[PDB]
Amino acid sequence: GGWSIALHGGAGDIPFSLPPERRKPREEGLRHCLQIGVEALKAQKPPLDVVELVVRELENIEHFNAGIGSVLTNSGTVEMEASIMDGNTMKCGAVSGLSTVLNPISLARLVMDKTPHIYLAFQGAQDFAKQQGVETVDSSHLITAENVERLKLAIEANRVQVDYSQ
């Protein structure tokens, strides 16, 4: 009759032997966020509003590499990026180099609608966030032990790795 929705939490090298501690929260994440997307479409929110809603929730799953739970740079810091696109108008919004913005996807939207630009990055994009008043957090709040441990292993191997790496 009408709506469909899909979502993801990352593509990569995920072993069949992903431990319970690593697997259940991601499986739970997928469900939680899918319930929300479905309910929003059921309540007929515009699809553009729905994808921002679902990604804010995906961003909020600590076990997915976006927002809280973002993987780390070679310097052990956080740099998040996001983009969003309305297929009906071709409008879009994007951001890069966020370190304190709690929900990057929502800044991408804000740039789309409130700026004659599509893409803002690094200091300038934190300036925009400050100006717009979105939620920002101490950088540490974005960091997970799992991610620190991955950096370490990637940093001795001298590799750039996908969150999901053997």
Partner: protein, 133 residues
């Protein structure tokens, strides 16, 4: 990388993608996620959100190729999605989710696994990690 694509009853399509990027990236490194036509794209015909080895998604302009194969060569969502993923990207580097104007859903990937879900108004649901095999 996270993402979500959705379409309503009228064909209104949209896409969103967010990420921390790659582990151990150089400072200042930009991936596919913030680029339009690479990691995120949406259209009259479809919406796409990609994930994996950023650089490999930029190189193949993944999200846009899908839309482009559909409109220009007439491929269905399924065929276009499979084609970009399984024929134009090295293996183990890329998955994507997509929906079409008319409600179709495609979730191909050439990585070992991709955390993904989807649903339709008619009643379908699926959570998944590895390929159905």
């Amino acid at each position: 990388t996270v993402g979500c694509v959705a379409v309503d009853s009228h064909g209104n399509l949209a896409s969103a993608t967010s990420t921390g990027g790659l582990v151990n990236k150089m400072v200042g490194r930009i991936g596919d996620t913030p680029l339009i036509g690479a990691g995120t794209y949406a259209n009259e015909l479809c919406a796409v959100s990609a994930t994996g080895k950023g650089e490999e998604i930029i190189r193949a302009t993944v999200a846009r190729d899908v839309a482009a194969l559909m409109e220009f060569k007439g491929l269905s969502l399924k065929e276009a999605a499979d084609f970009v993923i399984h024929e134009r990207t090295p293996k183990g580097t890329v998955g994507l989710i997509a929906v079409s104007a008319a409600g179709e859903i495609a979730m191909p990937f050439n990585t070992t696994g991709m955390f993904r879900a989807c649903a339709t108004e008619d009643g379908y649901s699926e959570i998944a990690i590895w390929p159905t095999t």
